[PDB]
Design a protein around this nucleic acid. Structure first.
Lengths: 265, 118, 134, 175
RNA sequence: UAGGGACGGUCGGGGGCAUCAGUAUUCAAUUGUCAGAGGUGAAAUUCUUGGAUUUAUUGAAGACUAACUACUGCGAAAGCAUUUGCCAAGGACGUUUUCAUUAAUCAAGAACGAAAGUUAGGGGAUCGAAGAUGAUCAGAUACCGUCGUAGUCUUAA
């Protein structure tokens, strides 16, 4: 392959905008102990890429940032993010910096990047809340994760805080606490009392985390609840599929019984 | 010869506060907020309630020892009315009428400085 | 829009205080132009320091023709060259802070103003076809 | 000892020079002094030694800044009695665009001034919509009513709703 | 005294990023003091002797840029007011600089955003974020493929 300072320049005449091949050539030069020509390739990749194609420039920035996080410097990673900011939106560049810090396993730099997100993008939207929840969940403090997510949800609007709470509950069912996930699910079903979009989210999260007696019973309550025929049959069929995955034929039949009870009125 | 408190009177709408701390403000003396002298729940912002509160404030200021008072008159401020209510004049008139010397009128209402309403 | 331009005199003559030679002007022009200087800058420096009024009056003909006859031609005409470099400067500035929509709008303007004199230069065939704005 | 001061715009000096002796007679009855400076364009007001009402320097301050904010002298003097106060409503920070802002402010003024004059009659106040603020003199219930009608007029609801409910509340408090 | 481009000193609350400041508001901590304090035309829900309200010292949060602020400025319009720096840009003027008709008006198409979702009853046929399912890559909930909730439909606020 193209993996030098001569052969890569000679063989890149067909595709000068080759982002992945330029990243592989830069990593091959860095493994070949040429950090100077590696960084030269990583900086000239976005220049040999087109101007209007911002994603290729962001890929060259991520390649130089990964090379700096592996065998470079934090000043080069900040240049790579300023470069990322010179190749894209500043919040996405700082999130790429947080990802490079998480790949370099610097916990203090990861927390500082999540805090710099949770100020500006935390007052903007919920992506910084998701980033703070990701950092504190990898740090294994779900209390501080939920506190930072609630703080960023207070800083940002609250109209997407319901889906943020459902995402927090699904993440807690995935790799956190199941009682905390069920509590956040009940809080989300309280905040959306008119919408069963939190009820099906709770049922799917419990069935994903193998809480069958939770998921099928709550979905049976939702199917026999104040719903229509389609809204009852969907929840009851999902609960019956979860109950048959657990091994409960009579409960899968009683789910359809509650569906027939709620559809006829 | 005079020893000074500070009045810290607060003439909101719907109430009047007379709260005479020492010259720092850390240590308070004789808070007799209006809506406790006489309450019909309407007359709590009235000049009569303000002068009753100021007169027994001045009674406790004289029993502690304070003879003169720097007076700071504060309206409800913020993103709201910013003008003192009916009781701010009557409170310091009664504090001056009931033997207590008055100094240094100043308005310390919170002008909100480019506030938050959108 | 405003009336802001230059007012060429009624005289097509040498200014009669201009004792300087009518050939050393051309040598000074080719000195600046092969030390690498654009023709508007040639004309304004020849005006300001080695003071000529404009060289079409004092020399035989205009200075882009002087450069072309002295073998010193530009690859691309000057107006189109400066519009190209302004477009690529604002394009590098755009591929930077992707939220400067205003600069996106004025990139639309600069490219729409590229194409006008580019197709003018194609119909005159100053620079040839198969030139398609990189 | 106390002293306050406002500074007034240049076009007011030919009016303030006229009514200044009446200012001196309306404050020397309260035993409080005042100068106006014509070269720096200011009006200051000082508590003298013969002043036994300490609150009157605040009302004299409100008086001279009303003379700054362009309210006529016989309209302005009513501050000097106790059941009368100022309010300066701020309207500039409600809506974004200039067109809708001046249309809602002209809506606060009214066709031929009818909304503003009816509001003055109902609230017993003196109201000047001016620039991007609304000054008002009145009793404190009138100040409360005029603040709620102006701050709800900058929101979409028409102020003749408030004029209607003020007439309803007057003839509904008359029983 | 058509048009375009260069230069020069600039001009502007034009834009993007970063920085800095301001005092309110809200919350928390620490005191001091005691019985009430919101709010209203009156009241009430609410806050309250593990001390509220007020006062003083802080800290944190998200906004926002008071006056100055104008029949003023800038922007193609929507719009744009704290400082400083960077990134490009724009306009008027000055010009004895340059090119030489390079020009004017508007049918498709777009970036913009002032430009939206306040609470409730109801039908869900389709689609369907949220949730989950198999391979790509040191790393892939997107890519490819489906089940599937609100919503997408309606009516008043």
């Amino acid at each position: 392959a193209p993996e030098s300072v001569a052969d890569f320049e000679r063989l890149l005449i067909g595709n000068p905008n080759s982002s992945v091949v330029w990243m592989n050539y830069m990593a091959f030069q860095l493994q070949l102990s040429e950090i100077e020509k590696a960084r030269e390739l990583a900086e000239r990749a976005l220049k040999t890429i087109n101007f209007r194609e911002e994603a290729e420039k962001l890929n060259i920035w991520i390649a130089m940032l990964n090379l700096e996080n592996t065998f470079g410097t934090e000043e080069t990673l900040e240049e790579v993010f300023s470069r990322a900011c010179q190749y894209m939106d500043s919040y996405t560049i700082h999130t790429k910096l947080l990802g490079i810090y998480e790949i370099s396993e610097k916990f203090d730099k990861a927390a500082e990047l999540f805090k710099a997100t949770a100020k500006k993008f935390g007052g903007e939207k919920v992506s910084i809340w998701v980033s703070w929840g990701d950092f504190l969940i990898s740090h294994n403090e779900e209390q501080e994760a939920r506190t930072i997510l609630g703080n960023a949800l207070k800083a940002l609007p609250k109209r997407n805080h319901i889906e943020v709470v459902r995402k927090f509950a699904q993440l807690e069912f995935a790799k956190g606490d199941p009682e905390r996930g069920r509590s956040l699910f009940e809080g989300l079903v309280a905040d959306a009392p008119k919408r069963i979009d939190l009820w099906n989210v709770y049922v799917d999260q419990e069935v994903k985390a193998k809480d069958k007696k939770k998921v099928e019973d709550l979905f049976e309550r939702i199917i026999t609840k104040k719903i229509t025929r389609k809204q009852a049959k969907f929840f009851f069929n999902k609960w019956l599929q979860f109950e048959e995955s657990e091994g409960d034929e009579k409960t899968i039949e009683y789910v359809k019984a509650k569906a027939t009870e709620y559809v006829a009125s | 010869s005079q020893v000074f408190g500070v009045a810290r009177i607060y003439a909101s709408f719907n109430d009047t506060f007379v709260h005479v701390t020492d010259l720092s403000g850390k240590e308070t003396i004789a808070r007799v907020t209006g809506g406790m002298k006489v309450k019909a729940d309407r007359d709590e912002s009235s000049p009569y309630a303000a002068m009753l509160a100021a007169q027994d404030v001045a009674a406790k200021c004289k029993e502690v020892g304070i003879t003169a008072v720097h007076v700071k008159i504060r309206a409800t401020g913020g993103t709201r009315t910013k003008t003192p209510g009916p009781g701010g004049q009557a409170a310091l008139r009664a504090l001056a009428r009931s033997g207590l010397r008055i100094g240094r009128i100043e308005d310390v209402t919170p002008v909100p400085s480019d506030s938050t309403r959108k | 829009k405003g009336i802001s331009s230059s007012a060429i005199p009624y005289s097509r003559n040498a200014p009669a205080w201009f004792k300087l030679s009518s050939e050393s002007v051309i040598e000074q022009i080719v000195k600046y132009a092969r030390k690498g200087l654009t023709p508007s800058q040639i004309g304004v420096l020849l005006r300001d320091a080695h003071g000529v009024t404009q060289a079409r009056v004092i020399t035989g003909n205009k200075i882009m023709r002087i450069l072309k006859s002295n073998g010193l031609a530009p690859e691309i005409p000057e107006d189109l060259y400066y519009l190209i470099k302004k477009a690529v400067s604002v394009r590098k500035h755009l591929e930077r802070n992707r939220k400067d929509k205003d600069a996106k709008f004025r990139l639309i303007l600069i490219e729409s103003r590229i194409h006008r004199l580019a197709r003018y230069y194609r119909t005159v065939a100053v620079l040839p076809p198969n030139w398609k704005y990189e | 000892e106390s002293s306050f001061m406002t500074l007034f715009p240049k076009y007011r000096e030919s009016y303030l020079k006229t009514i200044w002796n009446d200012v001196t007679r309306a404050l020397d009855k309260h035993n409080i002094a005042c100068v106006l400076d014509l070269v720096e364009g200011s009006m200051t007001v000082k508590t003298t030694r013969k002043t036994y009402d300490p609150a009157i320097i605040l009302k004299a301050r409100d008086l001279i800044k009303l003379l700054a904010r362009s309210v006529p002298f016989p309209q302005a003097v009513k501050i000097l009695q106790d059941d009368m106060a100022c309010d300066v409503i701020k309207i500039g920070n409600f809506v974004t665009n200039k067109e809708r802002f001046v249309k809602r402010r002209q809506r606060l003024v009214g066709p031929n001034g009818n909304t503003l004059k009816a509001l003055e009659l109902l609230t017993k106040c003196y109201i000047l919509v001016q620039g991007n603020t609304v000054s008002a003199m009145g009793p404190f219930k009138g100040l409360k009513e005029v603040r709620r009608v102006v701050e709800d007029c900058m929101k979409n609801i028409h102020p003749i709703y408030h004029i209607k409910e003020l007439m309803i509340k007057r003839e509904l408090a008359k029983r």
